Amino acid sequence: PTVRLATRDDVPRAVRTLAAAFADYPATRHTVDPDRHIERVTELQELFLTRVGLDIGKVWVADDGAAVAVWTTPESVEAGAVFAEIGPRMAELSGSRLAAQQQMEGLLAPHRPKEPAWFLATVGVSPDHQGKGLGSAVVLPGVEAAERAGVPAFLETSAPRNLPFYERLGFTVTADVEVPEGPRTWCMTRKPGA
Ligand SMILES: CC(=O)SCCNC(=O)CCNC(=O)[C@H](O)C(C)(C)COP(=O)(O)OP(=O)(O)OC[C@H]1O[C@@H](n2cnc3c(N)ncnc32)[C@H](O)[C@@H]1OP(=O)(O)O
């Protein structure tokens, strides 16, 4: 279980891991077109991993990409300009589920920290390596970094099996959001010193 920051050479295994990990995720199933679903989800994960994670955020990997963690920090300053580049393509990839994605964003936006914070954008572990402690190991550096910076760490999850996993890392449910014809979503925050 060797954890370190990611390089461009790691992207291929990382994207395979994220695509496989999010294959049956409730939020992805609600917000991404079912037509060529895995292909669409794979491009979204690649687009976020490279253009957001590696370019302006922070990305960690365990066992050369068997697990991945992507964060946006208070240091992620051209998030906005990056969003004008990749934004329209992400809407195309959402396809028929763009209205559902936009509805869900409106429900979660009020519960997001308006103050500077580290956001866990996405985390995935290869299905065959799940339950072996890799997820905890990849997310821990970002959690320690947020605490060192004196800012909260924040995330959103639509899978209730993840609540214990994040609770062990010091996170607490700050919002329990009901999505119409969609998945129940929990917003979680970890203030420095949890
Ligand atoms: C997008 C966001 O910010 S959150 C969405 C994160 N990713 C996903 O939900 C997609 C699929 N899930 C995964 O890739 C992984 O299972 C992770 C990253 C959530 C957890 O990583 P793991 O290596 O499995 O975790 P680790 O071994 O460190 O800890 C195990 C705990 O993870 C939780 N867990 C997460 N996903 C699962 C799952 N599919 N089935 C069972 N338990 C799971 C459980 O609470 C488990 O402990 P438990 O059996 O005692 O309840």
Residue numbers in the entry: 6 to 199
Authors' text:
Puromycin and the Streptomyces alboniger-derived puromycin N-acetyltransferase (PAC) enzyme form a commonly used system for selecting stably transfected cultured cells. The crystal structure of PAC has been solved using X-ray crystallography, revealing it to be a member of the GCN5-related N-acetyltransferase (GNAT) family of acetyltransferases. PAC adopts a fold consistent with the GCN5-related N-acetyltransferase (GNAT) family, consisting of a seven-stranded β-sheet interspersed with four α-helices. PAC displays the typical structural hallmarks of this family which includes a cleft in the middle of the sheet between the parallel strands 4 and 5 that facilitates AcCoA binding.
In the absence of cofactor or substrate, PAC was highly unstable and readily precipitated. Addition of either acetyl-CoA (AcCoA) or puromycin to PAC in solution greatly improved its thermal stability, with a 12 °C increase in melting temperature. The addition of AcCoA enabled crystallisation of PAC and the determination of its three-dimensional structure using X-ray crystallography. The poor initial electron density around the adenine moiety of the CoA made its unambiguous placement difficult and the adenine moiety has been modelled in both orientations.
